[PDB]
Amino acid sequence: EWQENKSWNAHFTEHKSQGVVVLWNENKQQGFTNNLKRANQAFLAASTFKIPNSLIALDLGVVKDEHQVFKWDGQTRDIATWNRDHNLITAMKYSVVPVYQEFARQIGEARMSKMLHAFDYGNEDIDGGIRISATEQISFLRKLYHNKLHVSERSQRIVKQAMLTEANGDYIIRAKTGYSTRIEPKIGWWVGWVELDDNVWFFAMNMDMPTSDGLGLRQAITKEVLKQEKIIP
Template sequence: MPRLTLYLLFLLALPLQAATQERTDWAAKFAVLDAVGTIVVLDERTPDKTTWVHNPERAAQRFSPASTFKIPHTLMALDAGVVRDEFQVFPWDGVKHSYAGHNQDQTLRSAMRNSTVWVYRGFASAIGEPRARAYLQQLDYGNADPSVTRGDYWIDGKLAISAQEQIRFLQQLYRNQLPFKLEDQRLVKDLMIVQAERNWILRAKTGWEGRYGWWVGWVEWPQGPVFFALNIDTPNRADDLHKREDITRAILRTIDALPAAE
């Protein structure tokens, strides 16, 4: 698809009130870590709710959401009654996984923090594809397609979402505007807390498909939220994963959405 067409699609997908600016200077933040990717940042602290983007063509492309899908998936599981609350324990079956944090009993909180795939695999099995598809269509989540030949549909299947679509979804969650119970939306936002200081709260979720990785979320300030959605290629696999957060934090600091690194 031509570059201009992709960029126009990106602009059309943004909130109508947002002024959009391409940040070519942010390329340096990717280059210093030898990373290729995109980031969309929507700053609602500004009067015109400015949206900044690095690599707008890629920001319009859809990728597997990987573990960023745990945000809507948790809402779906709560709504379907697959999980009662944040205190329910999911017993580990003893099967060893490469990440030690997966090799133990889990709750919603630990499953979100550790990205425990086997917990969410159980949710997917209990919800079933027809109901998952209905949820996704109701959410207007990416291409809303949970079909998969083998593996997990949010990693190995057809489900895909763009960085710009991630931003729209996060805005709705922030405002409790998703088609789920208010208390469930508030719980999921609590599970997403990564860091909290006196004047700001960072809520986010990582994702990794193997070939590329995500970090999406927002920073809450008294003046308003700052939403972000980053994805990068990960040719060096796990060795590249730190770049997701490193690049995002560096970029957020350029607009004072996070304090300077100590």
């Protein structure tokens, strides 16, 4: 079922980094990773939690649709793109914590907890202190892709639209980045999938990310693994 291909470690050491990439070939129901241990370690979800939070906000009506505006509160924060109005699409694009904090307040602790349980999300059992492994990310995302989660079809299609990250004639990537900072080890996340004409390859990676300047490596290393496996040109 799962195969460990340590040759991928080269793409982490090339950039003097340590981390994991987990791939899942949907057609063949086979998985691949460079590090079976780290594939199954649970790290803090950080921004990748915006995926279940979006779904829950939509299904409960807290977010009416992807065009609804969420006004900046006029408090300047360190990330300039946050200091403006947003809709669901822009808020995911720029990973706008204060907007998603608001969704969570309105959702409330009790319903948030009931729905993450319906989703079987994270390792924890019952980022709001949610730990989740890369392989657990894939399993959650496979449910999203197939519209199997316990929310409406509409909520799931809207979130998949908001995860749109890249598209050309060769592939479509839906995905979400994350950077976990408040507890060592500081790590970057990138989770999602790449759509091809007649297959889907799910992915989930995280990597030690001590500073901040390395954050591009999250996509870059993931793509080197995809190119090595001829999943993308």
